[PDB]
Amino acid sequence: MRECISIHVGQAGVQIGNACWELYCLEHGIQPDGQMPSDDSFNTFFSETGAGKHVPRAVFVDLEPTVIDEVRTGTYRQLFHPEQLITGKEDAANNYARGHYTIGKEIIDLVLDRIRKLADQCTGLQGFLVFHSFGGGTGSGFTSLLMERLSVDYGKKSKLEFSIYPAPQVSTAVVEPYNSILTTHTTLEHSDCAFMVDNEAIYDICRRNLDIERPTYTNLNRLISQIVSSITASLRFDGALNVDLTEFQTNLVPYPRIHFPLATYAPVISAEKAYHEQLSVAEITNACFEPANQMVKCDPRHGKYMACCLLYRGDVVPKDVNAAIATIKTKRSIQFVDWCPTGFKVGINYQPPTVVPGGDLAKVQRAVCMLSNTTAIAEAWARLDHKFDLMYAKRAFVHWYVGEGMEEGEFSEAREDMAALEKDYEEVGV
Amino acid sequence: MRECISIHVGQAGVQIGNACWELYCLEHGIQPDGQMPSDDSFNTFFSETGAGKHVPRAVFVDLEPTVIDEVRTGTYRQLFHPEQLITGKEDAANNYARGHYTIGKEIIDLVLDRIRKLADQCTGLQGFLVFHSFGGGTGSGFTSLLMERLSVDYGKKSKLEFSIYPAPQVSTAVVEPYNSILTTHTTLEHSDCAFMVDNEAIYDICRRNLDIERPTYTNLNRLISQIVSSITASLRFDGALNVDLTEFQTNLVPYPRIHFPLATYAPVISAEKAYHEQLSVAEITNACFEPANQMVKCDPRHGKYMACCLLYRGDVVPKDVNAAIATIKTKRSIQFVDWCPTGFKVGINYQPPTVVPGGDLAKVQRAVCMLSNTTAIAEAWARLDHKFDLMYAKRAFVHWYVGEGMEEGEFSEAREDMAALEKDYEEVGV
Amino acid sequence: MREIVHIQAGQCGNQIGAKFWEVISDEHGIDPTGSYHGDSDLQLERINVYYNEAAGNKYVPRAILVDLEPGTMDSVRSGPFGQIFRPDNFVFGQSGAGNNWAKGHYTEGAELVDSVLDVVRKESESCDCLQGFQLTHSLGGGTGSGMGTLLISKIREEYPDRIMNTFSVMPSPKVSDTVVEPYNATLSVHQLVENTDETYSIDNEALYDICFRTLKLTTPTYGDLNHLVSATMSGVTTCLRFPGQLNADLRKLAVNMVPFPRLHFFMPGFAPLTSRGSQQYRALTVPELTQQMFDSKNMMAACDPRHGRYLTVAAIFRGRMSMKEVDEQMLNVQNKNSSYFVEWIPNNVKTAVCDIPPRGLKMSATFIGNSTAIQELFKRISEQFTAMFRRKAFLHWYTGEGMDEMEFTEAESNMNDLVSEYQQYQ
Amino acid sequence: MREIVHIQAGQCGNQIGAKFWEVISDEHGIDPTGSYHGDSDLQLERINVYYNEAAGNKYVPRAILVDLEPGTMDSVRSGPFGQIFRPDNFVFGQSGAGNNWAKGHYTEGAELVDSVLDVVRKESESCDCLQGFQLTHSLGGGTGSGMGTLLISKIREEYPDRIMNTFSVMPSPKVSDTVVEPYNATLSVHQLVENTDETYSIDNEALYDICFRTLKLTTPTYGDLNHLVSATMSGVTTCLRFPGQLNADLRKLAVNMVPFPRLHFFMPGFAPLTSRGSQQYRALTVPELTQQMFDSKNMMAACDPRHGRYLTVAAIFRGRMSMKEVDEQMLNVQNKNSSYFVEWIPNNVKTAVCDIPPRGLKMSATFIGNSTAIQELFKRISEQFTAMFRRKAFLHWYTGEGMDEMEFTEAESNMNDLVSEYQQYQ
Ligand SMILES: CC(=O)O[C@H]1C(=O)[C@@]2(C)[C@H]([C@H](OC(=O)c3ccccc3)[C@]3(O)C[C@H](OC(=O)[C@H](O)[C@@H](NC(=O)c4ccccc4)c4ccccc4)C(C)=C1C3(C)C)[C@]1(OC(C)=O)CO[C@@H]1C[C@@H]2O
Numbered sequence A, B: 001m002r003e004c005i006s007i008h009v010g011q012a013g014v015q016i017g018n019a020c021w022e023l024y025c026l027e028h029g030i031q032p033d034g035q036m037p038s039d040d041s042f043n044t045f046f047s048e049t050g051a052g053k054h055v056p057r058a059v060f061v062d063l064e065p066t067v068i069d070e071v072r073t074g075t076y077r078q079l080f081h082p083e084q085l086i087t088g089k090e091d092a093a094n095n096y097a098r099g100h101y102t103i104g105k106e107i108i109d110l111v112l113d114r115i116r117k118l119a120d121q122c123t124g125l126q127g128f129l130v131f132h133s134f135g136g137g138t139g140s141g142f143t144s145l146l147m148e149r150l151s152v153d154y155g156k157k158s159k160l161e162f163s164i165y166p167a168p169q170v171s172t173a174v175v176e177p178y179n180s181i182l183t184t185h186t187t188l189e190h191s192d193c194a195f196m197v198d199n200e201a202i203y204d205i206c207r208r209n210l211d212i213e214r215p216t217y218t219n220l221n222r223l224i225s226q227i228v229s230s231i232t233a234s235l236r237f238d239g240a241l242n243v244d245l246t247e248f249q250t251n252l253v254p255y256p257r258i259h260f261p262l263a264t265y266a267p268v269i270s271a272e273k274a275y276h277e278q279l280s281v282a283e284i285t286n287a288c289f290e291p292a293n294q295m296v297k298c299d300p301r302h303g304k305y306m307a308c309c310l311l312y313r314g315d316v317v318p319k320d321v322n323a324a325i326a327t328i329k330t331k332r333s334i335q336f337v338d339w340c341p342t343g344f345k346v347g348i349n350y351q352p353p354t355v356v357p358g359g360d361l362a363k364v365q366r367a368v369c370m371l372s373n374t375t376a377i378a379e380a381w382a383r384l385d386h387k388f389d390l391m392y393a394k395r396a397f398v399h400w401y402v403g404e405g406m407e408e409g410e411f412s413e414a415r416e417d418m419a420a421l422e423k424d425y426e427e428v429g430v
Numbered sequence C, D: 001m002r003e004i005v006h007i008q009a010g011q012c013g014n015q016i017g018a019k020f021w022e023v024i025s026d027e028h029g030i031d032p033t034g035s036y037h038g039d040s041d042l043q044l045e046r047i048n049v050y051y052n053e054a055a056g057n058k059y060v061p062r063a064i065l066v067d068l069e070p071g072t073m074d075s076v077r078s079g080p081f082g083q084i085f086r087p088d089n090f091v092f093g094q095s096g097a098g099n100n101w102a103k104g105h106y107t108e109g110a111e112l113v114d115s116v117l118d119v120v121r122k123e124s125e126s127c128d129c130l131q132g133f134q135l136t137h138s139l140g141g142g143t144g145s146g147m148g149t150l151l152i153s154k155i156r157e158e159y160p161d162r163i164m165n166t167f168s169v170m171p172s173p174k175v176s177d178t179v180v181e182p183y184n185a186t187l188s189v190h191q192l193v194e195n196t197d198e199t200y201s202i203d204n205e206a207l208y209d210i211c212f213r214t215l216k217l218t219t220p221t222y223g224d225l226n227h228l229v230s231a232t233m234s235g236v237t238t239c240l241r242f243p244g245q246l247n248a249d250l251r252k253l254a255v256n257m258v259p260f261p262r263l264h265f266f267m268p269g270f271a272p273l274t275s276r277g278s279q280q281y282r283a284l285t286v287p288e289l290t291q292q293m294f295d296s297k298n299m300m301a302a303c304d305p306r307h308g309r310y311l312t313v314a315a316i317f318r319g320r321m322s323m324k325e326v327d328e329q330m331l332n333v334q335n336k337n338s339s340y341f342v343e344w345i346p347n348n349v350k351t352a353v354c355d356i357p358p359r360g361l362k363m364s365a366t367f368i369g370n371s372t373a374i375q376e377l378f379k380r381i382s383e384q385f386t387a388m389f390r391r392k393a394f395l396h397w398y399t400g401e402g403m404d405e406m407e408f409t410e411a412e413s414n415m416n417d418l419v420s421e422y423q424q425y426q
């Protein structure tokens, strides 16, 4: 009961997955061979076979072999079922249309057959946890092919989606704006709560809080997994105020399309800093309202908040939480909408945050993940549609998308649908 | 494969041949009896029989016995096949018409039968190397009878031709201008690249560079063979830039009739001088653009260059060659045509120049043969047609040519066709 | 799994190719006998990208070797790695190309291409999933320029959706060994602009400038130039042979690199490069790897990128390095040099990062630049062609092979059309 | 192989001939018996040019000996080399020519020529390839002048394409032994100008001038004059008997030497020549060999070449020598003496170079000059003829043999026509 099917797509989604499953195995005490030495706390994330082997409720999908062949060879080769690590032959080439129309069109009915064989083991499936890059060809095009199928096949089930989204300055591709804009139909129509994350924001959090001068991606993926462990903690553990995955959405989402919250986590801190400050509930609650800790490069003070889910975990008590959010309501720099006088959903879970033993991040008695619907996020969209406009005015790479079976008009129809989302997040702030 | 049939005509061609075959035997390590003590490097010039005897791909033709009976008696009597040393009974008397119409008319079908029996042993025949005097009766008249037959019998095959041509002052005959002018149809219509050489120019090169005050012909023929060994070296040996015998012509010849290049070789030097200078690639490259080293008495500065083939051999490296020809392009005294901005074909072969052990010429690590299409050579023609005009205005020896079956009008028709060649080499310089 | 078929044409293409097979055999840990002798499983994991597996665990490279003369086959077969190649994949004539493009395309190689193409089929049918064709040649002379572009045309017609990826050594005015290179090159660029998906434009003048002003080699040979070319050939395929933090297939390069279909002529480069007497004083770190990689001195075509703007650059890094540090430096470069990148593309740099640096390096970068300055290479070739063609000089050698003055006029027309399209975006 | 048939007529022709056979037998190393006794293979390589090979390795000279008296046959047959000749080749009458050209041509030799000509056939049919006829005679007296020119006419009609080459001792005013030499010579020059291909004009006045002012002989005999003639006879055929750097057949001489058909009257010479008391102080080198060879004192006709211009000169050198040095000296001569050569021929000197110098010399040159000054020999003969003929003196001796005054008028007419053709080009 309370199962989640976790679907990891492209290189970004698979490598965040290889950090998520590194965490969940430590947090439930499962060995990297899937065995458990010595309560059903693992049941959300792992199916148990009669040998005493816990097999993860996850699908890994990539259109090329390289990243999943590394999962099939590294320390987790014995964790996963061998046919739910799914590879094609041909890379999607950072082209949405290869992911959606031409290459991913061959693998999709093998992917959905594995998701069906997972869902048929779930006794009370709670939702999908979908992990991807907005800038990738597999990330945008295959996730958008998959979600369209899952939204007719599992129409009632909540689809939570964790997206690495293009930055203000940092970028890895020229066509990252095209793939991201083409994805905006997926998140609007075939998703229920979409967590945008930014590489440049997490790099700055790493520089300021973790004292690490030059991080890899493995440093980011240990922060993106710490957030999903904190979202799902109420599904897995005992708490004072456990939050259901639909209870979460009923407080986060004010209007059907207004489901793009920010997320942040506290305390992100180096183990050397964590001795010299006390890290009380009020300190870590106030840390979530700093621009310095937002994992998208936009300023929350240029918006209004609509709703917050303060998802506390570890040694946290409801007194201290009420006393903390009363100070957040006292501060005039943190502005809410006139129509949400309640503001805060609170969850409080008794399980401390798990340290990954190779990690940059301290042992702490308390953490909070704050997931936060705010008008400010529209600036991250108003950044990227201005990158799209400069290139599409020249038609600057469009022949590679048209050459792989896409209609040219889908670029106009995607920039149009993004302007209607960027309108809605401005329209509710009044 | 890569065979050449070498045809030596009259006294000059046979005696240059007796220096060429002296050289090729040393260079490939073949004894004067045709045996080889201890790679197919010899294959261009020698057929190999099952006894381990290497027999040269050559025909020697003379209308009188004296010079070839000396080849049949000297140290090379055992080298050649006895029926490819071909003699008539009767001298051509320095009369073109005896060579072409009256005496050589009897030997021609025996000469072509030997050339056929050589060509039928060639697996991939590259061309003909034809050696002769322009001033001789056999040299002009028999070569022009032979070439007319070879140009219908072997029409595709390249016919390279090495001509001893009459000098400004030095001469051995009164009728040398008549025989040379009558030959100009042969070189224009039935030849593909014609290397004019001059006895008076090589005598001056011998006086200045070799320190030999009074040379014989054996001193000249060891320089004329050193040039053909350098032309053919890329056919016989490994190199950094090997030049094919048609690759050579595609760079030398800008227009079908414009195939009369100069040639020069460096370092021509005495063994006593060669210790006191270093003879670098740049020194020997610059030596080829001195009027002092041209083997026809004409001044290259009174012309424009069209194309050069710098055929380097021995210890030469492509760096040093590029650095050398950049200085030749820097010098304004060396003038090229406006329509050849590339100027230089380069060949670089790994085999050092072979010293003939009785020779006047030094051991050197490096040589270059520069073969060079230039407008200047038209002065060597404008010298000799002025010698023809003085005699033909009086009809000064014409009764000996008319008496042996020639049409009188062929003298007018040959002086006419020479004026059309001397027009073409002036016409392209603009 | 993403097999490449490699093809070598003429002397230059077989020489940069026969050095390339020594470089990637060192990477994959393959002995000159074809046996594996490497350290690591990662060397073996993608050995199929370039080699067929054979009996006794011998690995045979998927090279086709093409020439119109036997002498370069004889020089390769006898060479440092010559025994590694399949005897059937040496396809050759007897009489050469004469440095004539029309001998390559219409006569001597038109006879031979039926014997080449049916070997390219045996290799491509042995592939599990072919990604593309990797052709090494020169644009001067006749074999690489005229037979290699005949062969590109035949393979393009037969495999229209696979990547056609060519490494193309091409003429320059101050380092030329041949009279008719402007003709041969102009007739060849007319085939590359239509058929290839990528063409990597390489120059002996720029390869000598790296040897003299960076490596400080006193006497650089063609063997030293072939080593600079083959380092970048090994560089661009790295992400389909080794694991990485950002993987980029040759197609993931093309989609990012080629804004408009015909603008696919790239200027490659490599880092680190040092003299052997100064490797002791450098720090190999990504900022220093970057400052060399974007230096006008480091790039392997004579076009100074300060005479144009980049459309796209791709920096394919190799080694253990930070993604923040790589993303920082590729930002700092195009903001501090913003006058040298086109402002209608909002990020001009693609990045890729492989976990496995070249044997004996801690880090490497292979650079690919698409720049409007590449017009200066096609402009100078066209200006040399024009002087020879305005007086029909040397054209009996081409028209004697059945070619027309109309084909020369149409090739130089298409050359100026390619120049005009790069100049348009400058 | 290029056989010569040699013919001797009258006392002078048999005396210069019988000395010539002693000279060429010394060269070819043949004993007075007819047996070979020489040093060298080169002596035996071309023995066929002048001899028939016969049983016991005896070599019989291809000479026909003709006279109208027995007494010169008796003097030759008994002489130093007399036993070498074939007994059948001595063809002779009994009653002499009386110093009468008409006895030679119409009576005494007209009887005998049927017995001569049928021996010239046996020798010419025994040849492998005949190149020509080499006839020795005198133009004074009756046998050589009148029978020898009858025989030239008969051999010319029978062998029209072979070289007819004559050595012709001929009259002069200050050294004459006979009253009617002007008549005999004028009747004989009329046959030489039409029939011969070359005629070498020799004079006893010039042969005595060489003996007195060069050789410093106190009492020169006809045996000493015959030795000077026969050195130049051996000289001009050298290149068909021995190897050389430049070979010249008698036909290769004629084609270069004879500009207009009838201008074939040559003035021979020889070098070195010294007194036996001064050979110790000379250097024989080519420049000194040249400065003597072109000296007006060295030539064997009384005509000073400073009274005309050369049409052609041929210098047939023998010995080991430089071609630069020979070509230098034959240039320097005709540029420093340019007023003595015709300026409508741009090079007046033919050269030839044999590798084998005469026995006991290190070098030799035989000189042949075709000069407009030869008119002075035909002019003086015609001026002597004219004085005798204007009064019909001695003509009953010729008209008694059936001759006409019309034949005298026609001969002196043709003499002045030959003089006028040499004077025309002066
Ligand atoms: C101790 C040390 O640092 O040694 C270096 C070295 O001194 C330098 C100078 C090397 C050296 O490079 C050269 O000598 C060279 C000469 C002419 C042209 C090109 C290179 C080196 O030979 C080259 C060699 O590189 C390799 O071995 C790579 O794996 C390379 N493959 C080959 O060079 C190779 C050679 C022979 C046979 C097979 C392969 C490679 C490059 C790209 C992609 C894959 C592989 C290296 C690191 C070094 C030495 C040995 C001195 C350099 O080359 C590379 C590619 O790193 C030249 O500048 C760099 C910087 C290095 O510091």
Ligand SMILES: CC(=O)O[C@H]1C(=O)[C@@]2(C)[C@H]([C@H](OC(=O)c3ccccc3)[C@]3(O)C[C@H](OC(=O)[C@H](O)[C@@H](NC(=O)c4ccccc4)c4ccccc4)C(C)=C1C3(C)C)[C@]1(OC(C)=O)CO[C@@H]1C[C@@H]2O
Pocket (backbone or CB within 6 Å): D022, D023, D026, D027, D215, D224, D225, D227, D228, D230, D231, D232, D234, D235, D272, D273, D274, D275, D276, D279, D358, D359, D360, D361
């Ligand atoms: C030591 C030395 O130098 O002896 C010479 C000599 O002293 C000189 C004076 C010789 C001598 O000549 C005479 O005495 C002579 C007398 C009258 C007429 C002509 C010659 C010599 O007898 C002549 C003789 O020549 C030959 O033997 C040639 O081969 C010659 N044949 C004959 O003379 C001969 C004599 C007898 C029987 C057979 C042949 C020859 C010439 C041309 C072509 C072929 C062969 C030579 C060199 C010399 C002596 C011996 C002193 C000279 O003759 C020649 C042709 O070289 C006369 O001036 C030259 C210069 C020589 O120096």
Ligand SMILES: Nc1nc2c(ncn2[C@@H]2O[C@H](COP(=O)(O)OP(=O)(O)OP(=O)(O)O)[C@@H](O)[C@H]2O)c(=O)[nH]1
Pocket (backbone or CB within 6 Å): A009, A010, A011, A012, A015, A016, A063, A091, A092, A093, A094, A095, A133, A134, A135, A136, A137, A138, A139, A140, A164, A166, A171, A172, A199, A217, A218, A220, A221, C245, C246, C247, C252
């Ligand atoms: N944090 C993090 N970001 C990543 C990681 N891998 C990739 N990214 C980001 O993903 C974006 C590019 O997406 P790709 O990695 O090319 O996505 P993909 O689905 O594999 O794309 P295709 O190769 O075309 O199929 C860039 O903006 C990267 O910064 C990772 O492991 N962690």
Ligand SMILES: Nc1nc2c(ncn2[C@@H]2O[C@H](COP(=O)(O)OP(=O)(O)OP(=O)(O)O)[C@@H](O)[C@H]2O)c(=O)[nH]1
Pocket (backbone or CB within 6 Å): B009, B010, B011, B012, B015, B016, B063, B091, B092, B093, B094, B095, B133, B134, B135, B136, B137, B138, B139, B140, B164, B166, B171, B172, B199, B217, B218, B220, B221, D245, D246, D247, D252
């Ligand atoms: N370098 C050189 N030049 C030579 C040689 N032999 C002859 N010559 C030149 O050849 C030219 C004359 O040509 P001939 O030797 O008479 O040619 P040929 O073909 O034998 O003439 P014929 O006897 O008429 O058949 C002259 O200008 C000579 O200088 C030789 O061995 N070497």
Ligand SMILES: Nc1nc2c(ncn2[C@@H]2O[C@H](COP(=O)(O)OP(=O)(O)O)[C@@H](O)[C@H]2O)c(=O)[nH]1
Pocket (backbone or CB within 6 Å): C009, C010, C011, C012, C013, C015, C016, C097, C099, C138, C140, C141, C142, C143, C144, C145, C169, C175, C176, C177, C178, C204, C222, C223, C225, C226
């Ligand atoms: N880098 C490199 N360049 C070469 C090599 N050999 C020749 N070249 C140069 O590039 C050009 C190549 O032409 P080539 O390959 O010889 O013509 P082809 O054989 O007819 O195709 C030559 O003119 C040389 O300047 C080599 O080994 N390496």
Ligand SMILES: Nc1nc2c(ncn2[C@@H]2O[C@H](COP(=O)(O)OP(=O)(O)O)[C@@H](O)[C@H]2O)c(=O)[nH]1
Pocket (backbone or CB within 6 Å): D009, D010, D011, D012, D013, D015, D016, D097, D099, D138, D140, D141, D142, D143, D144, D145, D169, D175, D176, D177, D178, D204, D222, D223, D225, D226
């Ligand atoms: N050189 C030379 N001249 C001779 C000889 N005998 C005679 N002469 C001269 O030349 C002339 C030749 O005439 P000759 O031969 O006697 O007349 P033929 O016998 O009737 O032909 C004579 O008058 C002599 O002056 C000789 O042995 N040698």
Ligand SMILES: [Mg+2]
Pocket (backbone or CB within 6 Å): A010, A011, A092, A136, A137, A138, A139
């Ligand atoms: Mg991907």
Ligand SMILES: [Mg+2]
Pocket (backbone or CB within 6 Å): B010, B011, B092, B136, B137, B138, B139
């Ligand atoms: Mg000859």
